[PDB]
Amino acid sequence: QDRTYRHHGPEVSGWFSEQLMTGKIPLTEVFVDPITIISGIVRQRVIPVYVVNDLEGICQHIIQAFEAGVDFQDNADSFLLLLCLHHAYQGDHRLFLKSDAVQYLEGHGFRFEVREKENVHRLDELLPNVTGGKNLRRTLAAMPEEETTEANAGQFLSFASLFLPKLVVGEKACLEKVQRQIQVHAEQGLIQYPTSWQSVGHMMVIFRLMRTNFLIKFLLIHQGMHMVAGHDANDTVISNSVAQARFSGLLIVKTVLDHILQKTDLGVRLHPLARTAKVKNEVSSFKAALGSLAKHGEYAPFARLLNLSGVNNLEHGLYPQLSAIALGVATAHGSTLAGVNVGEQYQQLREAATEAEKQLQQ
């Protein structure tokens, strides 16, 4: 039986482009084409891992500190880690230190050092230093030992996760997304957060925290993907939040990639118009950018959210020719690509792709 040639068009499913961006399919399947201590610099970020009795109590104090609008400038990691330790790992810090997630973080220069504190009076005791900013230490010491918060570590984390999906868009779009999502979860009877948390003041505090702190974002993403069973109401929210945040700030370039990929009866390949000499330079840079992205594996889809290096090179605007081919193919199927606009200079390439597609549809 000879070849039954069939044209199926672009990979609008998004499956193939996802595998390419997460390193599960090598880029050579579609495309073609050591740093030393004396040459490079690695910034180590030491994160104290405080083992403590009454981890619940300390977590309540941490929550109440955030509720009071306390701004942990760059000493938030230790306290935020205790929240994640208490909720996700239920106290077991040693199991966490063995995770593949910690190994990945050690790639980012993170160094987790355990520090045993038999008993700590308050949060001021968990930030020892003779030189650092003392405004926080005095503030944390000024915090009352009174229990005031209505929530727990789980709710704080699930609430924070709501900021992930639209974090990269801006403060207005993010907060509005949080508000809508809170209503969805509340109406469906999944979770109900404290009233005071939904105030503009409190939401702004959590927004500034999420936007500046890499670790809390990563740990939520870690929890959302690698939690396999025993899901709380909180775990469910977190998993849903992380799922929605997938490829946030990368959706446009991803659809461009989808439409420059062509599927036939033989398999998937790059669009012929993308294989011309005129565009080979753009494809080379694009492959290099995807390669840098794919090294992050299962964390690649949150690359723009986590502000990983090189992700700026994935803005579709940098690839007008590929965008043109992508839109050219899209328009042939009566479809359109959101956020993609081809200038007059590339319309000829755009029309060529359109005419090419409507030709192949036999």
Author numbering: -13 to 19, 28 to 356
Sentences copied from the publication:
The ebolavirus nucleoprotein (NP) is the most abundant protein in infected cells and is essential for viral transcription and replication; thus, it represents an attractive target for therapeutic intervention. Ebolaviruses are filamentous enveloped viruses that contain a negative-sense RNA genome of ∼19 kb. These single-stranded RNAs are covered by multiple copies of nucleoprotein (NP) and are associated with an RNA-dependent RNA polymerase (L), a phosphoprotein polymerase cofactor (VP35), and a transcription activator (VP30). In nonsegmented, negative-sense (NNS) RNA viruses, premature polymerization of the NP and nonspecific binding of cellular RNA is prevented by binding of the newly synthesized NP to the phosphoprotein (P). This interaction builds a complex designated N0-P. Formation of this N0-P complex has been proposed to be key to providing monomeric and RNA-free NPs as a substrate for encapsidation of the viral RNA genome and the formation of the NC.
The capacity of many NNS viruses to prevent premature NP polymerization via the N-terminal domain of the phosphoprotein prompted us to express and purify the chaperone domain of SUDV VP35(1-49) fused to the SUDV NPcore region (residues 34 to 367). Purification of this heterodimer complex allowed us to report the crystal structure of SUDV VP35-NPcore to 2.3-Å resolution. Here, we present the structure of SUDV NP in complex with the amino-terminal portion of the phosphoprotein VP35 at 2.3 Å. This structure captures VP35 chaperoning SUDV NP in a monomeric and RNA-free state. The structure revealed the characteristic bi-lobed configuration expected of the filovirus NP with an RNA-binding cleft in between. The SUDV NPcore contains two major domains, an N-lobe (residues 34 to 340) and a C-lobe (residues 341 to 367), both of which are predominantly α-helical. In this interaction, residues H10 to P12 of VP35 form a beta hairpin (β1), which is stabilized through main-chain hydrogen bonds by a longer beta sheet formed by β4 and β5 of NP. The medial part of VP35, residues S15 to L22, adopts an extended helical conformation (α1) located near the interface defined by the N- and C-lobes of NP. However, the comparison of these structures also revealed two previously unknown interactions between SUDV VP35 and NP: a hydrogen bond (VP35:R5-NP:D275) and a structured beta strand (β1) that complements a beta loop in NP formed by β4 and β5. Importantly, replacement of the amino acid residues involved in the beta strand interaction (VP35:H10G/G11P/P12G) resulted in a dramatic decrease in the dissociation constant (KD of ∼1.34 × 10−5 M). This result suggests that the newly visualized beta sheet interaction is essential for maintaining high-affinity binding between SUDV NP and VP35. NP is maintained in a monomeric and RNA-free state as VP35 occupies this hydrophobic pocket.
